[PDB]
Structures are given as structure tokens and as C-alpha cells.
């Protein structure tokens, strides 16, 4: 459990820290903005974590359990 929470926070921090260097010249955007009205923690969907990584990790992580025989 401790490993899972630390990895989830690390992946979210990695995704947030690279969102700044890509979206600068666009107008009227606040980086890292949440889409929820409350500040309470939510369990992140899979697109927020691996939405910037390669596709091999996608088919090895999303469908990996189902496709393992």
C-alpha cells in the first residue's frame, strides 16, 4: 500500500512537472488545474497517469492483466 501511494504521487508529480514546459505560449490556461469543485483527494483515472508515456506501457498496464492468458 505504501509503495502504491508513493508511486501514484510520483507519477502525478511527473505528469504535472512536464505540463508546465509544454503549455506556455497558449493563452488563458492555468497549469495543473483540477476539474473538481472540492479539494478532496480522488482516485485518479488511468489517463491522468500514463497519458504522456509510450503505448507499450499502455497495453502492458491497462490490458496487461486481462491479456495475460
Amino acid at each position: 500500500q505504501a509503495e502504491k501511494d508513493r508511486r501514484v504521487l510520483q507519477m502525478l508529480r511527473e505528469n504535472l512537472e512536464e505540463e508546465a514546459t509544454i503549455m506556455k505560449d497558449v493563452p488563458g490556461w492555468k497549469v495543473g488545474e483540477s476539474v473538481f469543485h472540492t479539494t478532496r483527494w480522488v482516485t485518479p483515472m488511468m489517463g491522468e497517469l500514463y497519458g504522456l508515456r509510450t503505448g507499450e506501457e499502455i497495453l502492458s498496464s491497462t490490458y496487461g492483466f486481462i491479456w495475460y492468458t
Binding site: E3, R7, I22, V35, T43, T54
Partner: protein, 105 residues
């Protein structure tokens, strides 16, 4: 004529399934358990019209938890920007995103 006999005889027929935030076998929460709890407890007993007029924020947050569509628009915008910046040629992915990263455990 909604003859609510489930409260007259005190017998539970289909109140155990009708709501996502009910009692589940082996205590498994759904994907929007907290949002369901907030939306029920905020909009309890005050009427549907007052619930819609006053408890709109938590219902909106619950609908965003369920559909996740605003997150889809966010991911679409950042991915279109990423594809564009690769296509012109002023972006290079880091080794962490490319795969050779040596994950935490």
C-alpha cells in the same frame, strides 16, 4: 399512486441496490462513493426543487466523477498540443516518459 408498501410492512425489497453508495458485498467501494455520499446527505429531505437549486455543486462534482469528460477535454487539449509540438519539432520526450525509467519499487 406510488403505494410505498416497502415502508408500510417494513420489508426491504429493492432499497439495497437502488443507490451506488449502499451496502456492498465484502465492503467494496465504487468509483464515486464519496461523491454519492455527499450528494445524498446534502440533498436529503429538503425537496427535489430545493436540492436542484442549492446542492448543484456536489451533484456537478459527482457527474464529473462519473463521466470524467472534463478530464477527457484536458487530456485531448494537452495531447493535441503535444502532437503539434512534435510535428513542428520543438519538443523532445524525457527518458522517464519514453520507457527506460526504472520505476519506484
Amino acid at each position: 399512486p406510488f403505494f410505498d408498501v416497502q415502508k408500510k410492512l417494513g420489508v426491504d425489497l429493492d432499497h439495497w441496490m437502488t443507490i451506488q453508495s449502499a451496502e456492498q458485498p465484502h465492503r467494496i467501494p465504487a468509483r464515486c462513493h464519496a461523491f454519492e455520499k455527499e450528494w445524498i446527505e446534502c440533498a436529503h429531505g429538503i425537496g427535489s426543487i430545493r436540492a436542484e437549486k442549492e446542492c448543484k455543486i456536489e451533484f456537478e462534482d459527482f457527474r464529473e466523477c462519473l463521466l470524467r469528460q472534463k478530464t477527457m477535454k484536458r487530456l485531448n487539449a494537452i495531447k493535441r498540443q503535444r502532437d503539434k509540438l512534435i510535428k513542428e519539432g520543438k519538443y523532445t520526450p524525457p527518458p522517464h516518459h519514453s520507457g527506460q525509467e526504472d520505476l519506484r519499487p
